Design a protein around this ligand. Structure first.
Ligand SMILES: COc1cccc(Cn2c(C(=O)NC3CCN(C(C)C)CC3)cc3ccccc32)c1
Ligand SMILES: [Ca+2]
Lengths: 234, 52
């Protein structure tokens, strides 16, 4: 995350962190329930084998609520393609259930119709992660969050050098130096509504980070809700 | 601005229209309240709640 603030105690409990064999975080994820993690499909090729850490806000200092979980099932959308990053979504089934607590809780899955006309019509969404604080910088050791305005779909397409499919949406600023970045992929994009947070996106990609005239590209969760429920049902 | 378009129909969460009228509902872990609008949690850790 470039700019924004750090997630304070109990502020971003649905945040999950995918870590490799060397316990390095390479991507984020969102807790959907005690057994399921929502992330990006393109994160799956980052490591040949990874685990899932929850309740972590400082990669170098155990707060006592941390907990590693092994992945039992990786459910990737068969239509995902590295050529365009379309259908950049995957669900992870954990071997052992997550224990909810102060910094560990699930985000809510909304209904499609309501999410698009009410959640995505709000002015801002919240993105978070342990990603880079600057485009060419290194990974953050502190979990960060950033409020990001929903971008008009027309402005989105006109600003992108790459195709923006119907499974993606733009969020962020035109010139302000705040945006998600490398390492945040697969992380949560949630929208607040009356004190309740709903999953609305998955950090996907972007042209650089916080660049002028460029926005953060997120997987449109509402387009996969039925798919997500199916992956969790079995 | 009518029904759900006017302040989410006074619903705490999901709002949908079926026959010129509002019907509210809630996410898993919540139950619609007596007023048929608010969403009451069912456990110690309902979804979407921060604990500051
Ligand atoms: C705004 O938030 C984010 C979140 C995650 C990553 C980024 C930007 N980003 C990307 C990237 O994304 N490449 C895309 C190019 C275009 N392709 C498309 C053509 C599919 C996808 C990879 C690679 C990369 C390397 C170092 C720093 C930032 C980076 C920005
Ligand atoms: Ca820690």
């Amino acid at each position: 995350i470039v700019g924004g603030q750090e997630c304070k105690d109990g502020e971003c409990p649905w945040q999950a962190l995918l870590i490799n064999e060397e316990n390095e975080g390479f991507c984020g994820g969102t807790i959907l329930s005690e057994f399921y993690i929502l992330t990006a499909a393109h994160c799956l090729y980052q490591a040949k084998r990874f685990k899932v850490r929850v309740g972590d806000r400082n990669t170098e200092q155990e707060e006592g609520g941390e907990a590693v979980h092994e992945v039992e099932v990786v459910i990737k959308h068969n239509r995902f393609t590295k050529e365009t990053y379309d259908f950049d979504i995957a669900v992870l089934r954990l071997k052992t259930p997550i224990t909810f607590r102060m910094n560990v809780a699930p985000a809510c899955l909304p209904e499609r119709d309501w999410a698009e006309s009410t959640l995505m019509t709000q002015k801002t969404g919240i993105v978070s992660g342990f990603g880079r604080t600057h485009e060419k910088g290194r990974q953050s050791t502190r979990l960060k969050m950033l409020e990001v305005p929903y971008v008009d779909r027309n402005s989105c397409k006109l600003s992108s050098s790459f195709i923006i499919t119907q499974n993606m949406f733009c969020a962020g600023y035109d010139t302000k130096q705040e945006d998600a970045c490398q390492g945040d992929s697969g992380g949560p994009h949630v929208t607040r509504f009356k004190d309740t947070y709903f999953v609305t996106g998955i950090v996907s990609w972007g042209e650089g980070c916080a660049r002028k005239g460029k926005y953060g590209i997120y997987t449109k969760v509402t387009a996969f809700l039925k798919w997500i429920d199916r992956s969790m049902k079995t | 601005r009518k029904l759900c378009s006017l302040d989410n129909g006074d619903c705490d969460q999901f709002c949908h229209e079926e026959q010129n009228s509002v019907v509210c509902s809630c996410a898993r872990g919540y139950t619609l309240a007596d007023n048929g609008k608010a969403c009451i949690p069912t456990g110690p850790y309902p979804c979407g709640k921060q604990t500051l």
